[PDB]
Amino acid sequence: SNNLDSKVGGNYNYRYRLFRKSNLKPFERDISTEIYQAGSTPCNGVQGFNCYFPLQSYGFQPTNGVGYQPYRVVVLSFELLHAPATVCGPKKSTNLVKNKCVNFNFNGLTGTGVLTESNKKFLPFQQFGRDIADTTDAVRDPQTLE
Amino acid sequence: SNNLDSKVGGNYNYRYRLFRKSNLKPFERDISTEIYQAGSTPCNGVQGF
Amino acid sequence: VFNATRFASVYAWNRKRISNCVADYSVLYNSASFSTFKCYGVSPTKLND
Amino acid sequence: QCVNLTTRTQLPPAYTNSFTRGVYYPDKVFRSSVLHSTQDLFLPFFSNVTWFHAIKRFDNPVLPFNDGVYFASTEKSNIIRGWIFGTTLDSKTQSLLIVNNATNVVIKVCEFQFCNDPFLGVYYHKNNKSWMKSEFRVYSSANNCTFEYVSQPFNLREFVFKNIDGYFKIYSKHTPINLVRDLPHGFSALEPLVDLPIGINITRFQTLLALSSSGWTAGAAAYYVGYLQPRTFLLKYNENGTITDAVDCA
Ligand SMILES: *[C@@H]1O[C@H](CO)[C@@H](O[C@@H]2O[C@H](CO)[C@@H](O)[C@H](O)[C@H]2NC(C)=O)[C@H](O)[C@H]1NC(C)=O
Ligand SMILES: *[C@@H]1O[C@H](CO)[C@@H](O[C@@H]2O[C@H](CO)[C@@H](O)[C@H](O)[C@H]2NC(C)=O)[C@H](O)[C@H]1NC(C)=O
Ligand SMILES: *[C@@H]1O[C@H](CO)[C@@H](O[C@@H]2O[C@H](CO)[C@@H](O)[C@H](O)[C@H]2NC(C)=O)[C@H](O)[C@H]1NC(C)=O
Ligand SMILES: *[C@@H]1O[C@H](CO)[C@@H](O[C@@H]2O[C@H](CO)[C@@H](O)[C@H](O)[C@H]2NC(C)=O)[C@H](O)[C@H]1NC(C)=O
Ligand SMILES: *[C@@H]1O[C@H](CO)[C@@H](O[C@@H]2O[C@H](CO)[C@@H](O)[C@H](O)[C@H]2NC(C)=O)[C@H](O)[C@H]1NC(C)=O
Ligand SMILES: *[C@@H]1O[C@H](CO)[C@@H](O)[C@H](O)[C@H]1NC(C)=O
Ligand SMILES: *[C@@H]1O[C@H](CO)[C@@H](O)[C@H](O)[C@H]1NC(C)=O
Ligand SMILES: *[C@@H]1O[C@H](CO)[C@@H](O)[C@H](O)[C@H]1NC(C)=O
């Protein structure tokens, strides 16, 4: 992202954590600006010997080398499969042929048949018809509702 | 077979197949080495991104 | 998420939550705008599945 | 904000006879002029539904939530306005908030720190001769959110709630009887309106009612709670494929 995130004098708005009392844990977030103790000495006040401010700013410049240039990160993270499923992959659809024999699928109602324009009316919440034998005999199109 | 085959720096002399268009058929052998295309692109010649 | 105005600083990193929607990446992995996309336990192909 | 209006000492529980209710379309399947039988979680016919009031009175207990709930109110001034469903009710876990606010219906799931006595409050006709909302007195905090929906903004009211397999299915019917008092027997069914895949456990629920921090009038209303049970119902569909009559087999 050198063409975005670099600034000719250095984009010091962007920052990291240069110092810490121990190496941090997976997905931890730390906002501390309290002065670090690099020796055995108790650092007190705004500066001192072995006192360091734990943050630092990047010198991101459009003239930096391919490496010292800035690079955006999005981690698409998700924990998985210990609840119901509230985000899923795309489910592409194709055009709706009629008066031909087909392997149909509607919302995951996979089946085989000839499809024809029903004169049955459904109340709005219903997706499929069954019959007297409690076998399926009809379905609503989830796109162009008929 | 470690005391027969395994060098200090390791036997790389044994290999397995990590990429393939399709799962192979029973008792089929594959001598292919043509570059697998994970990307949507074609990828002619020995190598590519 | 990607084409957002400005990004967050890594001392302070943004966490954005997502729900109730469908994740088409067809305008995402098939775009050469990213110099690095790696998944660490699924195929980027299989994600739409 | 969050306030204790703890004045009403608990009294003894009231009851009535749920003659022919809690029939709902069990699944989204069209069927017609056909008598389909099914075991599902249904309100047992003629059962002792537990009965509650606001008047003087403002009854709002943390009831059990076990094997699904039928809920209804007979109403004026839209007094019953949401329900707190959950399993600690104090942000030690998630819980589900359902609400009907004067701008919109909203449904949300977060680690809510609820009030000891959670409610919503509105000034009564005062000074400007308009009514208006002001006291949202249900929770103090919300930290870890999972689900958050808000509707596009803006009697007898019947509802069924099932938290089965981490899907919260809501069925309902708004049927405006002008009959002035009895719980009117005669037949109809609930359609499903919404399903939320929340995955949380629920063990208890409480209803929300519309009320300087203390001393007030509770607008008069009556509401009823009956838990569903596994039974087997024979369901008569008519030509249109509405559920037009039923038999509770037991
Ligand atoms: C997604 O679904 C809706 C149907 O619910 C499609 O909108 C319909 O488009 C047709 C054809 O132009 C109109 O006759 C309907 O009146 C539209 N319905 C609504 C709700 O306005 C929408 O176009 C679909 N998208 C795709 C890509 O198929
Ligand atoms: C509302 O009243 C309840 C009691 O009626 C208060 O709960 C008490 O909280 C104190 C600490 O403030 C505890 O020591 C008591 O054991 C609790 N008693 C009971 C019966 O709950 C509660 O704090 C009050 N809430 C507010 C906001 O004042
Ligand atoms: C009803 O609840 C909703 C959700 O909290 C409130 O909507 C928010 O209102 C403010 C001011 O209009 C907006 O900035 C927010 O963006 C709204 N949130 C959402 C998710 O749209 C609404 O104001 C509440 N109304 C009443 C009277 O309580
Ligand atoms: C919301 O969830 C986060 C993450 O599970 C909780 O943060 C944890 O807090 C506990 C207790 O302080 C710590 O032991 C963990 O190290 C924290 N985990 C992380 C990754 O931050 C947070 O406490 C939860 N909040 C509520 C109200 O439940
Ligand atoms: C099934 O529902 C339809 C729709 O309400 C009913 O048909 C209507 O009946 C009236 C009175 O004869 C007619 O004026 C309307 O034009 C009809 N509408 C349609 C779409 O046909 C029908 O009578 C109902 N049947 C049953 C047994 O419930
Ligand atoms: C209903 O409650 C009454 C008490 O008022 C009791 O005598 C009766 O047996 C109960 N019936 C049922 C079906 O629970
Ligand atoms: C009604 O009174 C409140 C304060 O009591 C005031 O804030 C509000 O603006 C008034 N409404 C109108 C329409 O004047
Ligand atoms: C709910 O309780 C059951 C049984 O203890 C448990 O298996 C499940 O993981 C719990 N889920 C949540 C979200 O608490």
Gap between the Cα atoms of D105 and D151, Å rounded: 5
- The residue type found at B44 is N
Where in D27-144 does DSSP place strands (E)? 29-30, 35-42, 47-54, 63-64, 69-74, 80-86, 95-100, 105-110, 112-123, 132-142
Neighbours of chain A (3+ CB pairs under 8 A): C, D
- Would an 8 Å CB–CB cutoff place D191 in contact with chain A? yes
List beta partners, residue D135. Answer: D121
Report the nearest atom of ligand 3 relative to the CA of D104.
1
Q: Can chain B be said to touch chain A, i.e. do they have 3 or more Cβ pairs within 8 angstroms?
A: no
The DSSP line for chain A is -HHHH--TT--TTSEEE---SSPPPTT------SPEE-SSS---SSS-TTEE-SEEE----TTS-TTTS-----------SSS---EE----------SSEEEEEETTEEEEEE---------TT--EEE-TTS-EEEE--SSS--
Helix/strand/coil (H/E/C) assignment for every residue in A55-90: EEECCCCCCCCCCCCCCCCCCCCCCCCCCCCCEECC
Gap between the Cα atoms of D57 and D34, Å rounded: 46
D143 CA to centre of ligand 4 in angstroms: 10
User: What values do phi and psi take at A2, rounded to 5?
Assistant: -55, -35
Chain D hits for A142, Cβ within 8 Å = none
Yes or no: say if A123 and D242 are a contact pair by the CB < 8 Å rule.
Answer: yes
Neighbours of chain B (3+ CB pairs under 8 A): none
CB contact under 8 A, C20 and D149: yes
Q: How many CB atoms lie within 10 A of CB D73?
A: 21
A30 CA to centre of ligand 5 in angstroms: 66
Distant-in-sequence contacts of A123-127, Cβ < 8 A, 24+ apart: A123/D30, A123/D191, A123/D240, A123/D241, A123/D242, A125/D25, A125/D28, A125/D191, A125/D192, A126/D25, A126/D28, A126/D29, A126/D30, A126/D241, A127/D28, A127/D29
| Residue ID of nearest Cα to ligand 3 atom 23 | D103
Gap between the Cα atoms of D3 and B6, Å rounded: 74
Of C11, C22, C29, which to mutate for an interface test with A (greatest number of A Cβ within 10 Å)?
A: C11
Yes or no: say if A2 and A64 are a contact pair by the CB < 8 Å rule.
Answer: yes
Yes or no: say if D137 and D2 are a contact pair by the CB < 8 Å rule.
Answer: yes
Burial class (CB in 10 A: 0-12, 13-18, 19+), D228: buried
Residues 6+ apart with CB under 8 A from A79: none
D98 CA to centre of ligand 1 in angstroms: 31
**Sign, Cα dihedral of A17, A23, A28, A32:** negative
Where in chain D does DSSP place strands (E)? 14-18, 29-30, 35-42, 47-54, 63-64, 69-74, 80-86, 95-100, 105-110, 112-123, 132-142, 147-150, 156-164, 167-174, 191-196, 204-209, 221-227, 229-237, 243-248
| Residue ID of nearest Cα to ligand 1 atom 28 | A143
Run of H or E residues at B5: helix B2-5
User: What values do phi and psi take at A42, rounded to 5?
Assistant: -65, 100
Q: Can chain D be said to touch chain B, i.e. do they have 3 or more Cβ pairs within 8 angstroms?
A: no
Report the b/e string of A4-29 with b at 16+ CB within 10 A.
ebbeeeebeebeebeeeeeeeeeeee
Query: How many Å separate Cα D104 from the centre of its chain?
Result: 17
- The residue type found at D89 is L
Query: Given A82, A84, A127, which is nearest D28 (Cβ)?
Result: A127
Run of H or E residues at B2: helix B2-5
CB contact under 8 A, D147 and C17: no
Q: How many CB atoms lie within 10 A of CB D66?
A: 13
Report the nearest atom of ligand 5 relative to the CA of D242.
28
Any idea which residue has 């069925």 for tokens?
D171
Gap between the Cα atoms of D170 and A122, Å rounded: 20
- The residue type found at A50 is N
- The residue type found at A11 is N
Tokens describing residue A137 = 């005999």
Report the b/e string of B8-43 with b at 16+ CB within 10 A.
eeeeeeeeeeeeeeeeeeeeeeeeeeeeeeeeeeee
Gap between the Cα atoms of B41 and B34, Å rounded: 15
- Would an 8 Å CB–CB cutoff place C26 in contact with chain A? yes
Report the nearest atom of ligand 6 relative to the CA of D46.
13
Burial class (CB in 10 A: 0-12, 13-18, 19+), D224: buried
Tokens describing residue C10 = 């890594």
D154 CA to centre of ligand 3 in angstroms: 12
Q: How many CB atoms lie within 10 A of CB D27?
A: 14
Cα–Cα distance list, D188 to A97, D18, D75, D117, D236 (Å): 38, 13, 18, 35, 11
Neighbours of chain C (3+ CB pairs under 8 A): A, D
The pairing of strands A128-130 and D29-30 is parallel
- The residue type found at D31 is R
If DSSP codes are grouped into helix, strand and coil, which group holds residue B3? helix
Gap between the Cα atoms of D191 and D189, Å rounded: 7
- The residue type found at A120 is K
Gap between the Cα atoms of D154 and D139, Å rounded: 23
**Domains of chain D, earliest start first:** 14-250 (2.60.120.960)
The resolution in angstroms reads 4.3
**Sign, Cα dihedral of A125, A128, A131, A135:** negative
Instruction: Tell me which residue of D85, D240, D104 sits closest to A119, measured CA to CA.
Output: D240
Gap between the Cα atoms of D191 and D197, Å rounded: 18
- Would an 8 Å CB–CB cutoff place A20 in contact with chain C? no
If DSSP codes are grouped into helix, strand and coil, which group holds residue C12? helix
The D167-174 sheet, strands edge to edge: D14-18, D47-54, D221-227, D69-74, D156-164, D167-174, D191-196
Yes or no: say if A62 and A8 are a contact pair by the CB < 8 Å rule.
Answer: yes
- Count CA atoms within 13 Å of residue A91 on its CB side: 10
Check if D146 has its Cβ closer than 6 Å to any atom of ligand 8. no
Gap between the Cα atoms of D20 and D18, Å rounded: 6
If DSSP codes are grouped into helix, strand and coil, which group holds residue D79? coil
Burial class (CB in 10 A: 0-12, 13-18, 19+), A73: exposed
Tokens describing residue B4 = 């027969």
Query: How many Å separate Cα D126 from the centre of its chain?
Result: 29
Run of H or E residues at B4: helix B2-5
Chain A hits for D242, Cβ within 8 Å = 123
